[PDB]
């Protein structure tokens, strides 16, 4: 259950959260609503030198998005950040 994330997030230090929170604000550099969509991710990938298809971006979000809403919020972003880091424990 998402309980694992709760404990992982709760354990996280205030400084660690602030660092990720700062990135979140930057990520929405392309969103006025403060939400992260394919457009925001598309810009990030573009800088990295990657320019795939929009269909792939949508599918990627679905993989991380449990609701499949196609959008990523702060809560989802935080979970994704921790999940990605844990992936390599």
């Amino acid at each position: 259950m998402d309980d694992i994330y709760k404990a992982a997030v709760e354990q996280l230090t205030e400084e660690q959260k602030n660092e990720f929170k700062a990135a979140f604000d930057i990520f929405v550099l392309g969103a006025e609503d403060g939400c992260i969509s394919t457009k925001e991710l598309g810009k990030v990938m573009r800088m990295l030198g990657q320019n795939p298809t929009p269909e792939e971006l949508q599918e990627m979000i679905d993989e991380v998005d449990e609701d499949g809403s196609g959008t990523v919020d702060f809560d989802e972003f935080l979970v994704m950040m921790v999940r990605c880091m844990k992936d390599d424990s």
Binding site: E19, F20, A23, I26, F27, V44, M47, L48, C84, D88
Partner: peptide
């Protein structure tokens, strides 16, 4: 297979953690 941006590239893209030149990967 042939995954992209495992996490190192992303960390460099933004502030996050320097993690030096690697985390727990040999060379």
């Amino acid at each position: 297979r042939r995954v992209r941006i495992s996490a190192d590239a992303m960390m460099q893209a933004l502030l996050g953690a320097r993690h030096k030149e690697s985390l727990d990967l040999r060379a």
